[PDB]
Design brief:
The structure is cut from a larger assembly and holds twelve protein chains of ten kinds. Chain E is mostly helical. Chain E is 48% helix and 0% strand. Classes of the chains: A mainly alpha, B alpha+beta, C mainly alpha, D alpha+beta, E mainly alpha, F mainly alpha, G mainly alpha, I mainly alpha, K mainly alpha, L mainly alpha. Bound molecules: cardiolipin (5 copies), Ubiquinone-8 and 1,2-dioleoyl-sn-glycero-3-phosphoethanolamine (PEE).
Chain lengths: 145, 185, 65, 136, 209, 99, 50, 99, 221, 50, 95, 47
């Protein structure tokens, strides 16, 4: 396309100064060489995309085989394996029971709880209980850990 | 106008309203985030076109790119990398966080701003739930003993015993005998 | 921690008081062979979650699907 | 996004700014050396509750079920399972709920007494003395 | 120069006439503005990113040719072609296999591309607004079955309550004021009539169905 | 108080290793049957339940679903309405809730 | 924090929704306006003190 | 709450719900940034396109590579074979020199 | 400042304007003090209804599965597809070398094998995720309809009718409440106290030690 | 933890403004029953209690 | 790109030493204001700083006045300096 | 259709080995290292 020239200065003569006009051409020449590679690669890229289209139908049947199995009850998707020995497994279960029985000291802030002085003035005189010194904390079944 | 907001409801019965607007059949296959990918991704596509402006003066295009960067920084915020996050205000719908509604700690982190008390501590219930160890994969190539030893380990089928907490891997705890080399900081 | 309800005076992890500090791993091969940082991508959902799909396969056969 | 509801809580950095949320229409942005505003630009005050552990819930359901079927006198073992399996923080939460609802019960009943108190201008008046008038 | 720059020139042809022909050759502020925004071929219009790719592509490709152009391990087993004693023949396919694995360098980048990310811990931190969570957050979860099944169950039971609700309101409309105040009343309550007032019986205050 | 302070109710044993701190063992930790031995054990229980424990199951499931209600008066309504008019104490003995 | 590299001041408006009611294209309209007033403040000061 | 809940606590309910947008083009930009960093690593330390006699970076790398390949005259085996093993071995003992 | 709309309505701000002087205005604020205690008490007399009506019991052992949400990582599949397309461009850009230079024969021969294996992984994950989402959607719909037909009978209990009759009694009572005077005194709702006290006396026993008794399904807030 | 980090990220904000009729955060009940209680009716006080 | 030829009479750095000093300290303060835990980074860097400097002192600097010179890198500079000189006289030698 | 195609799975790789996700990291590093080393040797025959 034509480029509008403000004509603020005269351009150098092309015959006297030829090097000043060459860069634009060699730049588009590089792109033309790249397009020759893009066009020549149509069958190679298309053959791969065609293979993916055929591979798509085998992957569909393999996923349903992987998930549903032979008789629709579940395939290898339901399988899970491990490298833990029998001791490693029962160590982890006891580690779960230990963390269940791992508490922090002091509990919560008592000042954020209902005061006994407030209950008296509200009409309910609270009864003082003793500490339950006979109960032993234990871990629940493994299904709850 | 308050009666105009209820126009699509006056022609329907209650059963039709519930089936129309409440009991939308579940379909979690849509790419809902394509709206954001198209919008924010347009900045990159616009740059591909804008980087070819025939403005002869280099410093003229410096002004154009600066103006275009001003449009992006209204969302991105911090121009430096690894510094912050962009800010986009999105619409509130029933499908916000739809795939993480199961997790409780995600809800507490998003919704609740707890008030610290005089006894300045995390609530004891929260600390107790946090000590129940998470599951950490046994596969590890970062420790050179496991990188060698696990090449001779035999993966045995872990038969399901009816629970959801089978510790078939190691536990994400600094005191676990298989995780002590991991730095929990 | 602040959002969880614990106000924080000061900053950092160089505890001035009676607490254990955990400096960064010394960037020397001795400590780099004994330790490695916790990879968050290794904390996973327990695979027993996949056993809930057994309910789907049984419901499909009950409904004649 | 709307202007956050006016909040006087702020934290100074270099000098006391005497921040007044009612002095300006739009809240000025927080500069690092000037001020930090309170958390929750868009937040309200609610009441929440922690969820007791699942094994602790199961022991409570076992006690209540065994209570309505066999009576309280034959539920000591189920009561001991609650004290043993439920973590101590859960038992402290269970103990505090009873004390709160005891307080709320006395407050609701004091409102009852003030409401049901017959004033001096309503002595001897019953529903027969009410005029046949509605809100309009 | 590239075709995208030529496409800009066709569209900016009227703009090029206003700036270059008219504004550029004037004087004053209008002249300075036109000469500054003159339209044409770009000064310093080279794209370094495009040039960065061409360089790294050519440099990495020359490495592929060296690593892939190896003497066969299989052909050296018979001691009949070009190789009698090759004590490191078992290393011949390590460089080619390494280069072929580089094809998935960008396909598998980061953690999310090597696994199902929603089953990993970092996905939870992203959905919480890039916020730190306890390491066992993936375990303390309510059943997704409950959340979705209860949402459907509640709305389905609301439609059946609406039908029962209509039959109760209609049946209570035909009830005497004595009956609607003594039924479901406390046993200690003695009924005393109120003056008869006119109060409409509106099902839905908003004109809904 | 030290931020890393825990109170544990069961005995633990710490490792006497340099540069590391962890629980290496639990005192008197007995290993039960393996995951495979437990699986075979459960298959035998599930097999007998599949072959010989499916008759009259619909009635017992209704009694179980009724007893998961909040109030007793709703349980009695569930038993009378859905379970063919069963008795509260009689169904509680079937399910094994009676002492 | 929008001008800091790797800010750790997470409680200083970093994790908040911060919108404004000024002109958009901030670094093009509002921020240059603050620098235009800054140049005036120092040019007026130089003229007065000198 | 009374039977299966904890204490009623007052918290501030954040109405703003943040969520990191899982996008595609953000990783493209991230790769472009790491590509600039890796190219700068190659541009400074692995660029041998200039004066090979004045740039000490190519003087060191050229003469060092030539001193290694000339050791093929020691008659160990095909240098084309074990040259890749030298590079891997250089990262075992090169830990001493922080390579 | 709770019971805002009730207090504003009792003051008459819905139909008129307050007196412009602080004396009569501040007396009018204190005049609704008795009525607020009455209306607060009425709202705490609602009879209970089955909680298993519009909400499944979350403590049911059925929900111990702790099932997660199966999702499709659209962004991951789209990125890896573009990275695979980037490899196809890298081959096309360098077609002449990969095709004619024999030193790159192994890339020419095994590029499609790696590309198919890469596509195989991208589509496998997408296809498997799609199957799991469809299995999840069809189960929650089928299971929900089974639980509806199982608990439909609970709507036939009389507690539902007792609950609605109480609500309609409150509506008719609050409609009869009216302002009687404008003396800015508590006696401006003189007849309304008798109406609301008769409502409270209708569902409670005033001559008890605790007229409002606590039950786990009661009204506190 | 230490995982993959991106150089630039965007954070969405599903703001519950309650003043936008474009999304599901618009409380239709509060506005309809508040506007209903503004008009003079016999149930004007009952709507305030609801 | 090609050699970035400057048309000025002084270099850019020497003409803006005051201004570059401002932005240099601005980004130092920027990092310092952003890094709340800079003392933790300093202490975590102490061991590797001591270790790598005491381990590599001899091979970098100590060799120049102690047991062995290790002149391998110098030999390559001297060979290049002679090749540079030969290229400088390529015209005379070939003529 | 065959079970050999199950090797394309990465959603449930944590159920079997979870080793693929870490080994390829070394392979990508190993290719980067050999790229820097081999290109230096072959290119630097030109001086
Ligand atoms: C045949 C001969 C010619 C005859 C025809 C001649 C007439 C042609 C015109 C009609 C045909 C046009 C075809 C498309 C139909 C569009 C219709 C329409 O209504 O669009 C209005 C359209 C959108 O209006 P909008 O709602 O305001 O959105 C823009 C906002 O900025 C948005 O801001 P935002 O913040 O709200 O959102 C950010 C935004 C991202 O937005 C941005 O970031 C851009 C910001 C601009 C830079 C900032 C500086 C702004 C400076 C202000 C002053 C600008 C003045 C510019 C005036 C330009 C006049 C057009 O991201 C997105 O929202 C999504 C973006 C992703 C969209 C997907 C891309 C699909 C595009 C089509 C693809 C196929 C076309 C071919 C490929 C392209 C050509 C190579 O207006 C524009 O045109 C915007 C300018 C875009 C640049 C146009 C360049 C492409 C022109 C192609 C011409 C043909 C190719 C060359 C052929 C040569 C041989 C013949
Ligand atoms: C139905 C469809 C239509 C059917 C009909 C049409 C199709 C007909 C055929 C079409 C063409 C087929 C192409 C092959 C036939 C070509 C005939 C020929 O003359 O070619 C000569 C041809 C000429 O040489 P060249 O052109 O100069 O260069 C060739 C290559 O560029 C590179 O050449 P290279 O020699 O340098 O490559 C060497 C490389 C070649 O790559 C391989 O073959 C991979 C080999 C890995 C397996 C090694 C197994 C070791 C022994 C295991 C024993 C038990 C096995 C149990 C297996 C159970 C599996 C779970 O092998 C190695 O690297 C050997 C060293 C391995 C490292 C050390 C491992 C051993 C020590 C560790 C022991 C650990 C255990 C110790 C204790 C044991 C307990 C006592 O050389 C070839 O062999 C060409 C093969 C190249 C691959 C072609 C692939 C094409 C794509 C097709 C799909 C894949 C098919 C193959 C899959 C194999 C399974 C992985
Ligand atoms: C701070 C800013 C941040 C903003 C973010 C964005 C940053 C900028 C990014 C810029 C880099 C990307 C450039 C994109 C286009 C921009 C326009 C442009 O190229 O510059 C003007 C460019 C001129 O360049 P120049 O700088 O002025 O001078 C060039 C020199 O003289 C010498 O000439 P030359 O030809 O030798 O120079 C080549 C030149 C430009 O060469 C080009 O032609 C650009 C081609 C780029 C295509 C990239 C892959 C896309 C594959 C096609 C997908 C199409 C899907 C369509 C679906 C529906 C249809 C079935 O450089 C490049 O090749 C740039 C490529 C960058 C590397 C990309 C490699 C990715 C592999 C790593 C994976 C990473 C994952 C992300 C992958 C994302 C993929 C979406 O204009 C042209 O080249 C005109 C080309 C006209 C013929 C091409 C017709 C289309 C053929 C497409 C290739 C087909 C391949 C096989 C299909 C594969 C899929 C099935
Ligand atoms: C939102 C608010 C925030 C944003 C606000 C905006 C702020 C933007 C800031 C940007 C400021 C404007 C940018 C102008 C250009 C950059 C400034 C500059 O000095 O360049 C002129 C200067 C040369 O200017 P010249 O006078 O025209 O050159 C004449 C001769 O040809 C030169 O060579 P000669 O030997 O023939 O002549 C003597 C030569 C003697 O000086 C030298 O030649 C330096 C020798 C070092 C080269 C030895 C090899 C080491 C470098 C190898 C490559 C590493 C990078 C690639 C590898 C990794 C790939 C990622 O020059 C001198 O007399 C003294 C030079 C200046 C004083 C020392 C400079 C120290 C600070 C600058 C370097 C920063 C390094 C990174 C630290 C920052 C953390 C990332 O450029 C350089 O020396 C290299 C710097 C290249 C730019 C990279 C840094 C950009 C940002 C710098 C900002 C200011 C420093 C901030 C940190 C200060 C820490 C103490
Ligand atoms: C065979 C080699 C030696 C093997 C012995 C074991 C290894 C040596 C350990 C102790 C080191 C002290 C000796 C300095 C050696 C410096 C050589 C050197 O670094 O190369 C410089 C050299 C060029 O640099 P240069 O500056 O010209 O070298 C001259 C020196 O600067 C200095 O100029 P120069 O002319 O004086 O050097 C001549 C060389 C002469 O060496 C010989 O001719 C060897 C002697 C004859 C053979 C004796 C060994 C017999 C072995 C068979 C018996 C074994 C039995 C085992 C059991 C039987 C098994 C079946 O050195 C000596 O003169 C040794 C005399 C020591 C003076 C002792 C005075 C009393 C000192 C008391 C205080 C000691 C404090 C020490 C503190 C702790 C140590 C740091 O580079 C090369 O030659 C490259 C090729 C490598 C040559 C072959 C490998 C030899 C080891 C080189 C180190 C690794 C290079 C390869 C990796 C490069 C990076 C990728
Ligand atoms: C095959 O053999 C091999 C080579 O060949 C020898 C190699 O060179 C190499 C080395 C690889 C390289 C040198 C490449 C390095 C590249 C890296 C590290 C990352 C590159 C990243 C970028 C260039 C950033 C690009 C940025 C973006 C894509 C985001 C902004 C762009 C947007 C939003 C456009 C939206 C995209 C589309 C619509 C897709 C459609 C595609 C198009 C081309 C349409 C373009 C449309 C227009 C209007 C221009 C390897 C590894 C190899 O294996
Ligand atoms: C992007 C790379 C292109 C080339 C790919 C080559 C490699 C081939 C290997 C691909 C393997 C396929 C794996 C599966 C990918 C799954 C794709 C996916 O998840 O997104 C699809 C998803 C479907 O949307 P839903 O209906 O919501 O979901 C329903 C699901 N059943 O698609 C989308 O969301 C649309 C966005 C996809 C990309 C769009 C590309 C846009 C480019 C614009 C240029 C076109 C010109 C536009 C001009 C406009 C004129 C008006």
């Amino acid at each position: 396309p034509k480029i509008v020239n403000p004509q603020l200065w005269p351009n150098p003569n092309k015959l006297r100064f030829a090097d000043l006009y060459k860069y634009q051409g060699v730049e588009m020449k590089k792109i033309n060489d790249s397009i020759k590679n893009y066009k020549a690669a149509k069958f190679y890229i298309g053959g791969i995309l065609g293979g993916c289209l055929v591979f798509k139908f085998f992957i569909d049947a393999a996923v349903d085989k992987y998930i549903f199995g032979e008789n629709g009850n579940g395939g290898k998707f339901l399988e899970m394996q491990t490298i833990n020995s029998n001791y490693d497994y029962y160590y982890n279960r006891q580690f779960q029971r230990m963390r269940y029985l791992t508490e922090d000291p002091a509990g919560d802030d008592p000042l954020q709880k209902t005061k006994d002085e407030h209950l008296v003035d509200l009409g309910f005189i609270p009864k003082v209980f003793g500490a339950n010194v006979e109960v032993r904390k234990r871990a629940p079944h493994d299904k709850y850990l | 106008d308050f009666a105009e907001l209820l126009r699509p409801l006056r022609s329907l019965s209650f059963n039709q309203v519930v089936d129309r607007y409440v009991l939308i059949p579940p379909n979690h296959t849509f790419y809902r985030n394509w709206t954001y990918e198209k919008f924010l991704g347009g900045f990159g596509l616009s740059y591909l076109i804008l980087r070819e402006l025939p403005l002869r003066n280099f410093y003229a295009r410096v002004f154009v790119m600066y103006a275009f960067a001003a449009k992006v920084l209204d969302h991105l915020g911090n121009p430096f990398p690894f510094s912050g996050h962009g800010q986009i205000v999105a619409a509130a719908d029933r499908w916000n966080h739809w795939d993480v509604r199961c997790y409780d700690n995600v809800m507490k982190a998003l919704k609740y701003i707890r008030i610290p008390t005089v006894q300045n501590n995390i609530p004891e219930a929260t600390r107790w739930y946090g000590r129940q160890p998470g599951h950490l994969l046994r596969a590890d190539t970062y420790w050179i003993p496991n990188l060698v030893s696990q090449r001779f380990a035999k993966h045995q089928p872990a038969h399901w015993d009816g629970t959801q907490n089978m510790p078939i891997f190691r536990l994400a705890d600094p005191k676990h005998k298989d995780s002590y080399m991991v730095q929990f900081r | 921690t602040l959002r969880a309800g614990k106000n924080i005076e000061g900053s950092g992890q160089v505890h001035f008081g009676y607490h254990d500090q955990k400096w960064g791993m010394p960037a020397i091969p001795m400590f780099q062979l004994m330790y490695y940082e916790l990879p968050g991508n290794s904390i996973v959902v327990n695979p027993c979650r996949n056993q809930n799909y057994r309910l789907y396969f049984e419901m499909r056969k009950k409904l004649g699907i | 996004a709307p202007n956050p509801y006016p909040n006087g809580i702020h934290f100074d950095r270099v000098f006391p700014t005497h921040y007044d949320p009612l002095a300006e229409t739009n809240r000025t942005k927080a500069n690092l050396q000037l001020i930090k505003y309170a958390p929750g630009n868009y937040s309200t005050l609610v009441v929440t509750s922690e969820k007791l552990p699942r094994p602790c819930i199961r022991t409570i359901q076992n006690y209540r079920r065994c209570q309505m079927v066999n009576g309280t006198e034959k539920c000591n073992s189920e009561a001991q399972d609650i004290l043993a399996i439920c973590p101590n923080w859960a038992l402290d939460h269970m103990k505090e709920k009873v004390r709160f609802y005891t307080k709320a019960l006395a407050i609701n009943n004091q409102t009852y007494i003030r409401a049901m108190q017959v004033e001096e201008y309503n002595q001897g008046r019953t529903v027969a003395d009410v005029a046949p008038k509605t809100w309009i | 120069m590239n075709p995208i720059q030529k496409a800009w020139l066709k569209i900016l042809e009227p703009v090029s006439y206003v700036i270059n022909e008219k504004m550029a050759k004037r004087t004053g502020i209008i002249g300075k503005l036109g000469r500054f925004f003159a339209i044409g071929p770009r000064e310093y219009g080279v794209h370094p990113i495009n040039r960065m790719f061409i360089f790294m592509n050519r440099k990495y490709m020359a490495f592929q040719a060296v690593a892939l152009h190896r003497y066969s391990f299989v052909k050296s087993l018979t001691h009949n072609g070009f190789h009698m004693l090759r004590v490191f023949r078992h290393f011949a396919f390590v460089l080619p296999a390494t280069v072929l694995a580089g094809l998935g360098l960008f396909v598998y980048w980061g953690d999310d591309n090597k696994c199902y990310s929603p089953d990993r811990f970092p996905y939870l931190k992203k959905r919480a607004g890039d916020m730190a969570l306890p390491l066992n957050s993936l375990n303390q979860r309510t059943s997704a079955h409950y959340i979705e099944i209860n949402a459907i169950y509640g709305a389905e039971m609301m439609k059946r309550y609406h039908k029962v609700w209509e039959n109760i309101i209609e049946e209570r409309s035909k009830a005497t004021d004595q009956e609607k105040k003594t039924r479901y009343a406390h046993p200690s309550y003695q009924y005393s009539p109120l003056p008869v007032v006119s109060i409409p019986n509106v099902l839905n205050p908003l004109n809904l169905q | 108080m030290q931020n890393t302070t825990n109170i544990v109710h069961v005995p633990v044993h710490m490792g006497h290793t340099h540069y590391f701190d962890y629980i290496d063992s639990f005192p008197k930790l007995k290993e039960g049957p393996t995951l495979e031995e437990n699986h075979i054990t459960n298959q035998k229980i599930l097999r007998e339940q599949l072959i010989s424990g499916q008759q009259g199951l619909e009635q017992n499931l209704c009694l179980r679903n009724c007893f998961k209600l909040s109030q007793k008066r709703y349980i009695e309504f569930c038993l009378d309405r859905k379970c063919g008019g069963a008795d509260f104490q009689r169904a509680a003995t079937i399910l094994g809730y009676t002492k | 924090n929008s001008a800091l590299i790797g800010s750790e001041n997470q409680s200083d408006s970093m994790n908040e929704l911060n919108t404004n009611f000024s002109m958009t294209y901030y670094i093009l309209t509002v921020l240059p306006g603050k620098f235009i007033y800054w140049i005036y403040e120092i040019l007026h000061t130089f003229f007065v003190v000198c | 709450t009374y039977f299966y809940g904890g204490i009623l606590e007052f918290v501030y309910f954040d109405k703003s719900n943040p969520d990191m947008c899982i996008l595609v083009h953000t990783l493209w930009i991230h790769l472009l940034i790491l590509f600039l960093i890796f190219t700068g690593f190659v541009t400074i330390l692995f660029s041998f396109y200039g004066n090979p006699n004045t740039e000490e970076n190519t003087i060191d790398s050229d003469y060092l590579a030539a001193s290694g390949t000339v050791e093929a005259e020691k008659e160990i085996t095909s240098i084309d074979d074990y040259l890749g093993l030298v590079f891997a071995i250089a990262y075992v003992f090169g830990v001493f020199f922080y390579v | 400042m709770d019971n805002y709309f009730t207090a504003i309505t009792l003051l008459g701000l819905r139909d008129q304007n307050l007196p412009p002087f602080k004396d009569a205005r501040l007396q009018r604020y204190k005049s609704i003090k008795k009525m607020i205690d009455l209306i607060e008490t009425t709202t705490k007399l609602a009879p209970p209804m089955p909680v298993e009506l519009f909400m499944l019991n979350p403590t049911d052992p059925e929900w111990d599965d702790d099932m997660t949400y199966p999702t499709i990582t659209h962004a991951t599949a789209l990125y890896k597809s573009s990275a695979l397309a980037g490899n196809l461009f890298l081959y096309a850009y360098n077609y002449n070398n990969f095709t004619a230079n024999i030193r790159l024969r192994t890339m020419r021969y095994l590029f499609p094998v790696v590309s198919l294996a890469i596509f195989g992984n991208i589509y496998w994950d997408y296809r498997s995720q799609l199957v799991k989402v469809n299995l999840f959607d069809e189960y929650i719909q089928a299971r929900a309809q089974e639980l509806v037909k199982q608990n439909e009978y609970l709507l036939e209990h009389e507690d539902v009718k007792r609950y609605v009759w109480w609500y309609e009694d409150l509506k008719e009572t609050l409609a009869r409440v009216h302002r009687q005077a404008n003396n800015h005194k508590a006696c401006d709702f003189k007849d309304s106290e008798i109406i609301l006290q008769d409502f409270i006396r209708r569902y409670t026993n005033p001559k008890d030690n605790l007229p409002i008794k606590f039950h786990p399904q009661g009204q506190t807030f | 933890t230490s995982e993959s980090v991106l150089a630039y990220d965007y954070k969405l904000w599903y703001l519950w403004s309650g003043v936008s009729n474009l999304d599901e955060s618009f409380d239709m009940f509060f506005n309809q029953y508040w506007a209903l209680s503004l008009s003079t009716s016999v149930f004007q006080l009952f709507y305030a209690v609801i | 790109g090609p050699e970035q030829v400057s048309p000025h009479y002084e270099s850019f750095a020497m003409s803006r030493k005051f201004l570059l000093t401002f932005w240099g300290g601005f980004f130092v303060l920027n990092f310092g204001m952003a890094t709340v835990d800079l003392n933790w980074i300093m202490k975590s860097t102490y061991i590797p700083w001591i270790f790598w400097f005491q381990l590599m002192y001899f091979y970098v600097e100590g060799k120049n006045s102690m047991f062995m010179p290790l002149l391998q890198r110098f030999y390559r500079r001297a060979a290049a300096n002679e090749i540079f000189t030969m290229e400088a006289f390529y015209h005379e030698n070939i003529e | 259709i065959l079970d050999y195609l199950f090797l394309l799975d990465l959603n449930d790789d944590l159920t079997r080995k979870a080793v693929f996700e870490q080994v390829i990291i070394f392979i990508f590093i190993y290719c980067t290292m050999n790229f820097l080393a081999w290109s230096t040797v072959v290119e630097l025959i030109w001086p």
